[PDB]
Amino acid sequence: PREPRPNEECLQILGNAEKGAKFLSDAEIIQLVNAKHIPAYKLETLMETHERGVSIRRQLLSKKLSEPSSLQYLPYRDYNYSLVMGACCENVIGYMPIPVGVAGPLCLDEKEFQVPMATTEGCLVASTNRGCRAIGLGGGASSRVLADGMTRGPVVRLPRACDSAEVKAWLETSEGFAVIKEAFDSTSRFARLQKLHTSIAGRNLYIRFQSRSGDAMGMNMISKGTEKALSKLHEYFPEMQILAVSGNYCTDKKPAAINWIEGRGKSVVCEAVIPAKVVREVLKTTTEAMIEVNINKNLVGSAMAGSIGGYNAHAANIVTAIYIACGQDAAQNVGSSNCITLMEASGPTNEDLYISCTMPSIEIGTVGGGTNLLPQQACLQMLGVQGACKDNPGENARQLARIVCGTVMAGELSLMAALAAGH
Amino acid sequence: PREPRPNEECLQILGNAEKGAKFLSDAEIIQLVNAKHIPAYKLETLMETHERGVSIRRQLLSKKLSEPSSLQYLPYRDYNYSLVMGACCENVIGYMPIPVGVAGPLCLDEKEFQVPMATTEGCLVASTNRGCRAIGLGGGASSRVLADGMTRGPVVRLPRACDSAEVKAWLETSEGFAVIKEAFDSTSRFARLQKLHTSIAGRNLYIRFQSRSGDAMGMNMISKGTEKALSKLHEYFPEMQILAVSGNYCTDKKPAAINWIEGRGKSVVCEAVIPAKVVREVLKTTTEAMIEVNINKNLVGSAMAGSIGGYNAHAANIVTAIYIACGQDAAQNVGSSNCITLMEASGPTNEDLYISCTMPSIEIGTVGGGTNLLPQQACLQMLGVQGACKDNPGENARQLARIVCGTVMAGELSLMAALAAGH
Amino acid sequence: PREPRPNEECLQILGNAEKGAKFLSDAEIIQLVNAKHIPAYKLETLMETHERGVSIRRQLLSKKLSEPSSLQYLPYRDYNYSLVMGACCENVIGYMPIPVGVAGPLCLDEKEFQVPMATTEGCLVASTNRGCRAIGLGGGASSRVLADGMTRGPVVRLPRACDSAEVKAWLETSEGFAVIKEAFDSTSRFARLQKLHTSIAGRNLYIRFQSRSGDAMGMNMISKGTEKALSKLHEYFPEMQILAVSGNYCTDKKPAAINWIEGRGKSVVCEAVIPAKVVREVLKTTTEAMIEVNINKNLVGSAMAGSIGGYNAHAANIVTAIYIACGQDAAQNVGSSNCITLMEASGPTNEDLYISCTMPSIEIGTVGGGTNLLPQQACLQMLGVQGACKDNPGENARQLARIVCGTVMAGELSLMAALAAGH
Amino acid sequence: PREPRPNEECLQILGNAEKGAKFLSDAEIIQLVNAKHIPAYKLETLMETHERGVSIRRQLLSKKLSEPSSLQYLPYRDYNYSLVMGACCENVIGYMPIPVGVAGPLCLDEKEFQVPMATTEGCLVASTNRGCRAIGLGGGASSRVLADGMTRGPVVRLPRACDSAEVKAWLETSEGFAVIKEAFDSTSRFARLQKLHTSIAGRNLYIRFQSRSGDAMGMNMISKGTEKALSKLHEYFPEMQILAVSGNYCTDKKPAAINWIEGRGKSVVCEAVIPAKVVREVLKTTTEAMIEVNINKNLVGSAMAGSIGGYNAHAANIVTAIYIACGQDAAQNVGSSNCITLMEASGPTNEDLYISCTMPSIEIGTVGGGTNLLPQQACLQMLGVQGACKDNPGENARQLARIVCGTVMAGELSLMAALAAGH
């Protein structure tokens, strides 16, 4: 054993650049932190290795818990914290393992994918797998990206609603839009402002900037561009007050009709045709039952519940699983799960099942944020969409959006079949 | 090195109960699986240890990838798969580490909590921490659970809309409700049917069963009860057809006005008062600016975007982080993030900031599903709400809902201050 | 001719109770009004006959118009103003004739109705007529009232959200509800409080009182009851502040999900089955086309437009026409037109067209307001629902709601057939 | 007295062009109609005068009523039916008088208006008048038209969702849009296609054509243009099926988020500043109370009710009254009443009340439909906006929209003051 050296003493070893942390014990570091000498947030930098830093943070936290042994089974060792510091999380005390299953092969646009799904919900992966199998036997699915651009919705305020109208009119002209577009586009190589969407409420003006962002999800880049554009706008209207760079008009991570109607991020449609025989043998139902359930649950049931954009069975399940697996911001599922699922009869006999999923607001990226960590990069890699696509910028993000829509469609197929076979 | 024994041979070692898997190589197991002898889904059971089983699955998957080395940095070893098999995930190929940070202390209802947040979004934990600090300096927050019950919304169909009306009327009487309540309650000790909510659309009848479920999230239990109740209902109306046990009328994991208006799971309100001085020094703004931004972003901005239940800054961020940390079903954030944030002036001088968050549909549990895994249990434990509360059933789930609402409120405070200080 | 006597002089004739207005000229009355002696609003009382009073008001108004001859073709003579004064309109300058057509016979619940429709929209009545004919040939329609009660949604405020929670909890107990119900019911013979619906937002508590109101539309009576109930509630919580007797939580004359989900006024469902032959010969289409159009316009189209409660073709047309004809408050069409139209195949061959309309929020009455005028009473009379039904209170209002739903259904049938035959 | 001549006989007088109807009695005409010789719908043409024709129709209808005397007080005489036949109504049996009151002067954009309001709701005109007075004392209101174009939302269907994507992409190019614009614009002098808005759902493509329409409301003209444009589109995609010219994507006469977000018809904003003294003396309240009520009723209350576009007190009342007075299609109030009302403190002391109303979807016209009748033209004339404005097409419709927004704002001011003074 041993015992803790006084503070002033300990604060010196820390300073000796040939004899630093590593000559101090956990108790000595604890003492230094408690005297408010060391800032606990700097532990991963201040300590010898990053792992130790998180160890020290864990010990400190444990001391303050009603059950000191709470963190025992929270894993923290043998994890690369270098990539998380100053990028992804703060006050780190370990990591939360989420089991990763694989659904597939998903036969989409003449290719095959193996889709990783990080979930703690039993049977979700198996159900998605059955849907994938049905689609595969059906001759594969097809998808298209319909629109692409991340949006940011700042709110500005003018002295009078008349002034707000003037600003809106000026933004609607070709010259004003050109000036704003130049200012916005100057901030990055992928910043290419598309048509603006404005909304007035009294003297509040809400401006929705939209743009592609390469392979990144685009929030940071769009925000930077917006800021620059708002400065430029302020030059012409010095009385304008920028109230908030985010005025809930984007709309980011909230249910909003605007995302459903205008789109946000990527808008995708996927479709497939399942032969009648396959619907019988794999899905254990019939086309007629599937259509009946689809109409009376996904359309009418959602309408009676007063849903905007929730005209599907469980798109949120698949979207969340894939998002967590692939390092996406999982909160964005709120907006990204918007989907409408349609089923119809098809074929020369009206016996085959046509299915389509439409998802207008898939917010997704393959660069930046959570996609900078190796484990999430692995899941992106097994799909073939990891990182930036140098040849055709944004192609990887588009492909990932297509895969997400296809997987959602497989999940819908399976769950709807299960509900229709019923009991 | 060595080389693979033939199939028939290999299939025998597998059978010898004194000489089973463990005498076979990875290549031999691969051969057996490829001949369709072994079902790959049974690998974790079929193999010697579970870890090997997932190893075999990983090798098989790697062979089919365009980049065989994709899984290199997806971790799978030294993880307890026994708790995941047949409960939480299928076709497991490893786990996805999500960094866990800690925000707090959160001073809520005269107690202090240390809230784990699993996120890959930089600065989220720090911002929540600043909000927690402001609330703490403000004399702590207060919360109340207003309603509690998980819901399931089956859809049934009658021959005619007149028959649907008859069934609805019968469900509305005391005798019919009593019969249905008895049938529903017989299925479990926590199943206590509360008042029914019906909606007709033509000959479709949508019935929303609601009930408390102890400390479990309640989906499985509510579904079981619903099934039993629907059988009982079928006894009185033999012409009734149960179309789907889930008719999107719950509503589960979709944006729906019904959850916002009636509630789903737990309905919570939290409030605090931040002194003016604290708003100046910690939040770097003023009360007036905070109220202006709150009105013109969370209320008016959300209204212009056509939001139902999205009258907040970023409740989804906090909700998702906590949910992933604590083993909740993360897809449920779709419904659980519904929140309205209100700010007003308060105090003898109208200088202090009153803030409140109202979240009517927090779907949450501390037993079952993802909460059965030790790492997620650790995060539940550091909050003091892990598992069932034997004395007062459902108390732990209620406490967790209160903490979620309080943390959301801290996050709102911080983000709104950041937006208001602006630039 | 003649010329105007001085004011003081003229003000005396007005006073002589044997020689009053009628001895004064229009110019003399004009002079008196312009000197601010007579209050123009009292003209119909102050003048000899009411008609003259409105004549004087018209002359005064004409003097102030840029085109003095504007009122020439606005009719005002030979109209009974006695019933409008102090009841229905103020500053009356005449009346606006709305042409009234008749659609029918509508074969509903084994009776025949002749439905008056006041419209200036060409072809609306003819289209409704064709729908009525199709329904009649189909063996008539059937309807049911599913729920009945007008609602008022006051908002009150407590010092703290905790206090609001306390009040909500107290309202949810049997004793508190009993006290409130007694207070509410004491105000009128039809005031019978049904279950309360509360919603908290911070320290705001929104309370939705619901009740039947006999044959009246019920707004006045419900408001009176609410006031009394709120006074009683204030007795138990002296800190409560009644912020507004209408907190937009009713919700009255605004689009709101709450009316769609919970109902407001009368909730009705109507249905019919149209034989295939009749669909061919009268509607000039086929059942399959009708169902296709219904799904892809009323369900999917409305979903893509982000509609709450607008899952129909043109229910608002029929509702407005009937409401204007029958003396209903026409603004209420905003809420009353909420409808979902469903069409399916039916019969032994799936060749016949089953149609149903569901309208959960028909706000309607046959006593009070506009129903006190003879012309509107005539339209109510030709339906057989005029005034109060002494035997079975509220029966006439219910019948009128059924007729409204049936007529809406006929209109939907016709318009949908027209759209499907297309070109 | 006399008695009825036989049919064959009577059918001949009808034919004699020197001795036609007018030599036949009401009983003889009745006999002819009942033998199915005369088509009752042709009565106004077939009879001598139009008035007689409606008389005959009334007698026929009376015979079939349970109370033959029902029509006694439904007026039909001395009304110009020539303008209603083949334009405005069918099977006419008279007209429904709606009392017309006048609110004003409304001081708007430096002019004064006298606004006619056709209502049977007591106190509505008086309340609007008080609001007008307050605004007038406040130095008048200001308004701006922000956007202008009526929309039509057809739905077309392609064989596959991929084909729908192809069509959407083609519509998004400059060349495709140019072709469609040419085809659309060829149909009328006011048809000037603006940017298209498309939405896919599976293989359904919803296209929202928008355009100004001169002074007409524009539905007929927009529909004609759409038809022509869809034919042109069919030329390039022969597999396209036009499913419905109206796919509920306009959206016409239904609550829809799309009208709220994108606008429909005219988008208007109006504002005023009420001095504190005027708020005290005329409105009998204070600015602080007004703002409190506005926030907690029009914003928070509407949010809790799950309103899209209903963030106001009673805009529907004013809109309906004006619409009925001025010959507008009253059903359109459903969409046209969408409004958000905002109140703030203003002035050097924050004592004055700033108010603004924003109405993005005012559907309105001053030519065609109900505006072709003299009584409604009178109400349009007293506003100075009757008919087409030859110099500046569409100016009259824009002015009327501004007046509607201003009147709505006055009504909001008054009602909100009444609610705030409370009791």
Residues in chain D: 423
3-state SS class at C130? helix
Contact A243 B292 (CB under 8 A): yes
Considering only CA atoms, which of C313, A307, A341 is closest in space to residue D249?
C313
Across the A:B interface, residue pairs with CB atoms under 8 Å apart total 400
Three-class SS state of C405:
helix
Choose among A258, A209, A249: nearest CA to A233: A209
Catalytic one of C44, C148, C329, C412: C329
Side chain identity at residue D259, one-letter code: N
Question: With respect to CATH, is domain B154-244 assigned 3.55.50.30?
Answer: no
Residue C168: which of B146, B169, B204 has the nearest Cβ?
Answer: B146
B78 flagged as catalytic:
no
Asked whether the beta carbons of residue D305 and residue C155 sit closer than 8 angstroms, the reply is: no
Q: What tokens were used for D77? A: 């005489």
Could you tell me the fold of the domain covering A26-97?
Answer: HMGR, N-terminal domain (1.10.3270)
CB-based contact (8 Å) between B167 and chain A? no
A84, two tokens: 């998380």
Distance from C-alpha of D249 to C-alpha of D251, rounded to nearest angstrom: 5
Rounded alpha-carbon distances, angstroms, from residue C111 to B163, C186, C384: 20, 38, 11
Secondary element (H or E) of residue D375: helix D374-383
| DSSP strand pairing (B111-118 vs D310-311) | unpaired
- Joined tokens for residue B1: 């090195």
The CA-CA-CA angle for residues A347, A352, A353, to 5°, reads 120
Determine the Cα–Cα distance for residues C269 and B161; give it in Å rounded to an integer.
Answer: 7
Specify the pairing of strand B310-311 against strand B339-346. parallel
Q: Taking CA atoms, what residue in B is nearest to C165?
A: B146
What is the rounded CA–CA span in Å between residue D286 and residue B71? 68
Q: Which helix (H) or strand (E) holds D281?
A: helix D276-281
Element holding C341 (H helix, E strand):
strand C339-346
Query: What residue of B is the nearest CA neighbor of C163?
Result: B144
Residue with tokens 């909590």: B113
CB of D209 closer than 8 Å to CB of D197: no
Tokens found for residue B273: 């008062």
| DSSP letters spanning B326-376 | TT--GGGHHHHT-EEEEEEEESTTS-EEEEEEEEEEE---SBSGGGGSHHH
- Which residues, other chains included, contact A418 with Cβ-Cβ below 8 Å and sequence gap of 6+? A127
Task: Quote the longest CA-to-CA distance of chain D.
Answer: 88
Active site residue B253: yes
Q: What are the beta bridge partners of residue D198? A: D207
Cα angle value B164/B165/B168 (rounded, 5°):
85
Taking alpha carbons only, the member of B303, B304, B305, B272 closest to residue B290 is B272
Report DSSP letters for D118-184, one per residue: E--STTHHHHHHHHHHHHHHTT-BEEEEEEEEEEE--EEE-SSHHHHHHHHHHHHSHHHHHHHHHHH
Q: What is the distance between the alpha carbons of residues B259 and B264, in angstroms, rounded to a whole number?
A: 5
Sign for the pseudo-dihedral over CA of B346, B347, B349, B351: negative
Tokens of B317: 């961020």
* Burial class of residue D195, CB neighbours in 10 A (0-12, 13-18, 19+): exposed
Chain B contacts in chain A segment 2-61 (CB below 8 A) = 61
How far apart are alpha carbons A376 and A399 in whole angstroms? 17
Q: Report the amino acid identity of residue C51.
A: E
What is the number of other CB atoms lying within 10 angstroms of the CB of residue D163? 17
Neighbour tally for C177: CB within 10 Å: 15
Please report, as a single letter, which amino acid is at residue D218.
G
Are B44 and B38 in contact, with CB atoms under 8 Å apart?
no
D342 touches chain A (CB under 8 A): yes
- D28-97 folds as HMGR, N-terminal domain (1.10.3270)
Is A305 part of the contact surface with chain D (CB cutoff 8 Å)? no
Distance CA C13, CA C11 (A): 6
Tokens of D223: 């529909």
User: Which residue is it, tokens 């949006």?
Assistant: A151
> How many contacts (CB atoms, under 8 Å) link A and C?
38
> Which of B129, B254, B375 has the CB atom closest to A302's CB atom?
B254
Specify the length of chain B in residues: 423
| Cβ-contact C210, C219 below 8 angstroms | no
**Beta pairing partners, B207:** B198
Distance CA B380, CA B328 (A): 10
Give the Cβ contact number of residue D66 at 10 Å. Answer: 12
| Residues B271 and B313: beta-carbon distance below 8 Å | no
A201 CB within 8 Å of a chain C CB: no
Whether the CB-CB separation of A408 and A319 falls below 8 Å is answered with yes
CB B337 within 8 A of CB B264: no
C103 touches chain D (CB under 8 A): yes
Q: Any chain A CB within 8 A of the CB of C260?
A: yes
Phi-psi category of residue A72: left, alpha or beta, with phi > 0 → left and psi -120 to 50 → alpha: alpha
Which residues in chain D have Cβ-Cβ distances shorter than 8 Å to A204? 342
**Token pair for residue C89?**
């309109």
Whether the CA torsion B406, B407, B412, B418 is positive or negative: it is: positive
What is the Cα–Cα distance from B150 to B193, expressed in whole angstroms?
Answer: 10
Domain map (residue ranges) of chain A:
26-97, 100-147+265-421, 154-244
Q: Which amino acid is at A297?
A: K
User: Which residue in the list B227, B253, B297, B344 is annotated as catalytic?
Assistant: B253
Please tell us whether the domain made up of B100-147+265-421 is placed in CATH 3.90.770.10.
Answer: yes
Resolution to one decimal, Å: 2.1
* Whole-number Cα distances in Å, C104 to A261, A391, B26, C42, D220: 40, 68, 81, 43, 27
DSSP lists the bridge partners of residue B270 as: B143, B357
Supply the DSSP symbol for D298: I
A265-274 and A192-193 beta bridge pairing: unpaired
CA–CA distances in Å: residue D135 to residues A78, A329, C278, D343, D401: 71, 49, 58, 14, 18
Closest Cα in chain D to B300: D299
Q: Is D303 on the interface with B (CB under 8 A)?
A: yes
CA-wise closest residue to A158 among D309, D400, D142: D142
The encoded tokens of residue A226 equal 């917006």
From chain B, pick out residues whose CB is under 8 angstroms from the CB of A382.
Answer: 61, 65, 67, 70-71
Query: Judged by CB atoms within 8 Å, which residues 380-399 of C form the interface with D?
Result: 381-382, 384
Give the integer Cα–Cα distance in Å for C57 and C71. Answer: 11
What tokens does A313 get? 């069975």
**Rg for chain A, CA atoms, rounded:** 26
Contacts 24+ apart (CB under 8 A), C188-197: C188/C221, C188/C224, C188/C225, C189/C214, C190/C214, C190/C216, C190/C218, C190/C221, C190/C393, C190/C394, C191/C221, C191/C222, C191/C224, C191/C225, C193/C225, C193/C229, C194/C149, C195/B195, C196/C171, C196/C172, C197/C262
Cα D255 from Cα D334, distance rounded (Å): 7
Residues of D in contact with A162 (CB under 8 A): 142, 144, 271
Residues contacting residue A115 through CB under 8 Å, at least 6 positions apart = A102, A103, A104, A106, A128, A132, A322, A383, A403, A407
How far off is chain B from A16, nearest CA to CA, in Å?
30
Q: Of D402, D269, B420, which is closest to residue A203 (Cα–Cα)?
A: D269
Would you put residue B19 in left (φ > 0), alpha (ψ -120 to 50) or beta?
beta
Question: Rounded CA gap, D366 and D217, in Å?
Answer: 7
Q: Which of D315, D382, D122 is nearest to C93 (CA)?
A: D382
Q: Which amino acid is at C107?
A: C
CA distance D200 to chain A (A): 7
Which residue is closest to A253 within chain B, CA to CA? B316
- Nearest Cβ partner of C90 from D101, D307, D330? D101
Q: To the nearest whole angstrom, how far is the Cα of A124 from the nearest Cα of chain D?
A: 24
One-letter identity of residue B156? V
Pairing of strands D339-346, D310-311: parallel
Residues of A in contact with B404 (CB under 8 A): none
Instruction: Determine whether the interchain pair B244/A338 forms a contact, defined as Cβ–Cβ distance below 8 Å.
Output: no
Contact call for residues B243 and A293 (beta carbons, < 8 A): yes
Which of helix, strand or coil describes residue A241? strand
Closest CA to A102 of C416, D55, B70: B70
From the centroid of its chain, how far is CA B306?
A: 25
Verify whether the Cβ–Cβ distance C303 to A304 is below 8 Å: no
Size (chain C), residues? 423
How far apart are alpha carbons A240 and A125 in whole angstroms? Answer: 52
d(CA A285, CA A278): 9
The fold adopted by the segment(s) D100-147+266-421 is 3.90.770
Phi, psi dihedral angles at B333 (to 5 degrees): -55, -30
Q: Among residues D248, D268, D257, which one has the least CA distance to residue D151?
A: D248
Does any CB of chain A come closer than 8 Å to the CB of residue C146? no
Contact C90 D308 (CB under 8 A): no
Contact call for residues A121 and A405 (beta carbons, < 8 A): no
Contact between B136 and B195 under an 8 Å Cβ cutoff? The reply is no
Q: Name the DSSP class of C12.
A: H
Q: Show residues of chain D in contact with A160, CB under 8 Å.
A: 142, 271
Which regions of A4-140 does DSSP assign to beta strands (E)?
92-108, 111-118
Q: With contacts defined as CB-CB under 8 Å, which chain B residues touch C267?
A: 200
**In this structure, are residues D189 and D212 in contact, taking their beta carbons and an 8 Å threshold?**
no
Which residues in chain A are closer than 8 Å to B157, comparing Cβ atoms? 296
Contact call for residues D92 and D54 (beta carbons, < 8 A): yes
What residue type is D282 in one-letter code?
A: V
- How far does Cα C189 stand from its chain's mean position? 23
Give the integer Cα–Cα distance in Å for A64 and A93: 14
What is the residue whose two structure tokens read 């006439």?
A: C396
Give residue D137's Cα distance to chain centre.
31
Residue B35 CB neighbour total at 10 angstroms: 12
Distance separating alpha carbons of residues A366 and A381, to the nearest angstrom: 10
The backbone torsions φ and ψ at residue B345, rounded to the nearest 5 degrees and listed phi first, read -80, 150
Choose, out of A208, A356, A361, the residue to mutate when testing the contact with D (most D CBs < 10 Å).
A356
D20 by Cβ neighbours in 10 Å (0-12 / 13-18 / 19+) ranks as: middle
Instruction: Give the integer Cα–Cα distance in Å for A254 and A338.
Output: 11
Buried b (16+ CB within 10 A) or exposed e, B65-102: eeeeebbebbbbeebebebbbebbbbbbbbbbbbbbbb
Nearest to C331 among D71, D312, D320 (CB): D320
In DSSP terms, which residues pair with B205 in a beta bridge? B156, B200
Euclidean distance between CA atoms B203 and B237, whole angstroms: 14
Supply angle C-alpha D365, D367, D368, rounded to 5.
Answer: 105
Residues of C in contact with B144 (CB under 8 A): 161-162, 165
Distance between start and end Cα atoms, chain D = 66
SS3 A216: strand
Residue B367: name the closest of B221, B216, B222, B219 by CA: B216
Residue of C281, B246, B148, C102 lying closest to A305 (CA atoms)? B246
A385 and A400 in contact (C-beta within 8 Å)?
Answer: yes
Return the percent helix, strand and coil in chain A, to nearest 5. Answer: 45, 20, 35
Residues in chain C after which the backbone breaks (C–N beyond 2.5 Å): none
Q: Which chains touch B (3 or more CB pairs under 8 A)?
A: A, C, D
> Touching check for D335 and chain B: CB below 8 Å?
no
Closest CA to A97 of B325, B146, D76: B325
The residue written with tokens 């129709």 in the block is D57
Picking from B109, B148, B164, B311 by the largest number of C CB atoms within 10 A of its own CB, the best residue to mutate is B164
**Tokens at C302, concatenated:** 């409305």
Q: Which two tokens stand for residue A17?
A: 């650049």
Q: Where in the sequence numbering do the catalytic residues of D fall?
A: 121, 253, 329
Among the listed residues C26, C48, C121, C239, the single catalytic one is C121
- CA D96 from chain center: how many Å? 18
